[PDB]
Amino acid sequence: KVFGRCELAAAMKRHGLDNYRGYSLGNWVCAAKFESNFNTQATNRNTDGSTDYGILQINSRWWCNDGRTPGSRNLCNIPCSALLSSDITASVNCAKKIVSDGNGMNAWVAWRNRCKGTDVQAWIRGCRL
Ligand SMILES: [Cl-]
Ligand code: NA
DSSP states (O other): OBOOHHHHHHHHHHTTOTTBTTBOHHHHHHHHHHHHTTBTTOEEEOTTSOEEETTTTEETTTTOBOSOSTTOOOTTOSBGGGGGSSSOHHHHHHHHHHHTSSSGGGGSHHHHHHTTTSOGGGGTTTOOO
16 A cells, blocks of 8 residues: 555554654654655565565564564564555554664664654644644
């Protein structure tokens, strides 16, 4: 599924991401735009053989099991496929654990490089929320 900007904003809010660990909803929508371009089926293979999955490009190195990342953890205790679903629940629950790990949204390199310190509330403005 390729979410609308406002559609994703609404889903992330109903799943409790607005101000989760102090990050306003715009931060989460900005992160999804540059991670996946709002495509739930996005994947990207890393040079280390791990894979990033779904709307927030969550990595098999630590967070989910795909059966093809030797020596990896699965700290979200989920199959990495679960993160490609048209329904964002598993991705939001996993992302809550990630952002609580110590480095907050810096865990998403694209958020640190492209969202952090910008007017992120621009990503939710005009949205019925
Ligand atoms: Cl933080
Ligand atoms: Na893994």
